[PDB]
Design a protein around this ligand. Structure first.
Ligand SMILES: Nc1ncnc2c1ncn2[C@@H]1O[C@H](COP(=O)(O)OP(=O)(O)NP(=O)(O)O)[C@@H](O)[C@H]1O
Ligand SMILES: Nc1ncnc2c1ncn2[C@@H]1O[C@H](COP(=O)(O)OP(=O)(O)NP(=O)(O)O)[C@@H](O)[C@H]1O
Lengths: 318, 318
């Protein structure tokens, strides 16, 4: 393991920079040359590979997004195209490749191990979802959660007092963890998530039942996987008279400085990824499982929901 | 278990309110009457006990500190004094008492179980320290960590550019976790903690060795357990010419809105505490051990340091 490349792919999440920083610093410290791949897997095809120094990642740990960029490269689903990406690494004597992204970007990394015995591949879970296997939390999740806390606190403060209701759309993809954790933290009366059978009657039953009993504003937190905020406002107007503040949080949830948890967590995994490449291991995602740093094969990853925590959220509301 | 009292003791930490909120809501939901004890154990002697309703804890989850207050009651170390506190609960038909504080406040709770078979006692780890046994993190730690991130980022931004060095004092008590996690997150070149043998020569060796090699500012993060910030500035002037920004963070670290992690973590433990009182258990601290909610006897608690994570911090700096 004498040369390592690293790349960022998929949705950008807070701590991607810290993770890169960790990989670069760890590698150079172990006398490995490191190459920054720009623009996700698009970069990989464009031969947008550049050698990185210790200074390349100064003043980054606190930075939102990724300083190598990210892309969608839907063409990376093809053997023939991926051939051109492996050559670009092959020709340059790169033996290890580190991928920081979601479960989609992992699949790309799994392929490269399958289609090139010469390149070791490791995955680092840079995503907001908490959707990734073999890790309890992903790098981005804790930051997003607070971003939602904050923006909710701001909708509250910038609102008319006539507003009884806050139908708030939170980002995950197919995973209701964000909305459950965010819902709990802003003390939301309803939480709508793809994992629990959603009773709109019951939710309107509740809003009518406790506001009009003297509640300032109820807030409903909604997982994008489950439905849109406007959908929830539509479906709730089917029982009850409410249209008060359909706030569609969106891509702001992806931005902002990583919180402490993500910087630390990113750094540990960024390091670990480098250790495992030197150990000669491959085709694994790294993570934190039961407060323990671990590696899980891309096999096991592609072959979570705490209903307890959800029930508690509802105990705490009424 | 028909009546529960709850109290906050010791240093106030972010999420104490969320924890109370959780206890109150959970108890009432299970048709238990709940009593708010004001001013820590001082309240307990003053008979500052008041019945709480669901509304008593509205608009609190996001609030810093505790709305029942906290006190130092050094007199609570005495059998005779504690007699008067047990009567005050005894006379009122209170069968369970919930204590939210540090390991000091736990000891008080352990006593009451030992000196009253009639009152079940549970402890919830509301403290910044991360000093408490049977829990990986305490309620307050994640919030504090970001408070340090933020205030450091502000010292940076509000500083002259002539300043090469930032000797920053972080709060823990006898535990260097905060300074290690904070140190890592602001990318600090030195981290001074009570657990590792501190080489001041080596630290000045490093500042001289890399600033004067073109580094804007080095930051040194210092655990209060280990030494004062001024002590570190003094001891460093014994090798090298530096006195640039001895910022003594202090009690601001205790304040501020809890982050997401602490609200959630507080809520889970606040609930769990109530469950365990109904289950008939006693003299335990609750917590989260290897991503699992657990209870540990006050016995085991009074009978952590990741040197790996510390080593990584130093790999990532130079
Ligand atoms: N199933 C797949 N097979 C091969 N390559 C893939 C696959 N899925 C994704 N990729 C490649 O990796 C990129 C990742 O896209 P995407 O699935 O949006 O990222 P993600 O890593 O899941 N992040 P997020 O969108 O936050 O979940 C795609 O643009 C492709 O370039
Ligand atoms: N060893 C003890 N025995 C009996 N009572 C105690 C003991 N230590 C503390 N107390 C009581 O509990 C309070 C807690 O004080 P302290 O040790 O400051 O709190 P803590 O819970 O450790 N929080 P922190 O200061 O953040 O660590 C004291 O003021 C006493 O009222």
């Amino acid at each position: 393991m004498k040369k390592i490349a690293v790349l960022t792919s998929g949705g950008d999440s807070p701590g991607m920079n810290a993770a890169v920083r960790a990989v670069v610093r760890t590698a150079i410290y172990n006398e490995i040359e490191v190459y920054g791949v720009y623009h996700g897997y698009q970069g990989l095809l464009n031969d947008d590979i550049h050698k990185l120094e210790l200074g390349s990642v100064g003043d980054t740990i606190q930075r939102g997004g990724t300083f190598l960029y990210s892309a969608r490269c839907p063409e990376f689903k093809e053997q023939e195209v991926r051939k051109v990406a492996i050559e670009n690494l092959r020709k340059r004597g790169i033996e290890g490749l580190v991928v920081i992204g979601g479960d989609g970007s992992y699949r790309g990394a799994q392929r490269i191990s399958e289609e090139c015995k010469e390149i070791q591949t490791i995955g680092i879970p840079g995503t907001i979802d908490n959707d990734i296997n073999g890790t309890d939390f992903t790098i981005g999740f804790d930051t997003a959660l607070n971003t939602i806390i904050g923006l909710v606190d701001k909708i509250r403060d910038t609102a008319s007092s006539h507003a009884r209701t806050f139908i708030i759309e939170a980002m995950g993809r197919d995973c209701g963890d964000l909305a459950l954790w965010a819902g709990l933290s802003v003390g939301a009366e309803t939480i709508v998530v793809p994992e629990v059978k959603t009773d709109i009657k019951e939710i309107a039953d509740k809003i009518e039942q406790g506001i009009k009993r003297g509640k300032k504003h109820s807030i409903v937190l909604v997982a994008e996987g489950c439905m849109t905020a406007q959908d929830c406002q539509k479906e709730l107007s089917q029982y009850i008279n409410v249209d008060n503040r359909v706030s569609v949080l969106g891509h702001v949830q992806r931005g902002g400085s990583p919180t402490g948890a993500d910087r630390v967590l990113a750094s540990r995994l960024g390091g670990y990824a480098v250790d495992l490449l030197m150990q000669g291991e491959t085709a694994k995602g790294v993570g934190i499982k039961n407060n323990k740093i671990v590696a899980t094969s891309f096999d096991e990853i592609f072959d979570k929901f705490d209903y307890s925590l959800y029930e508690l959220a509802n105990k705490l509301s009424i």
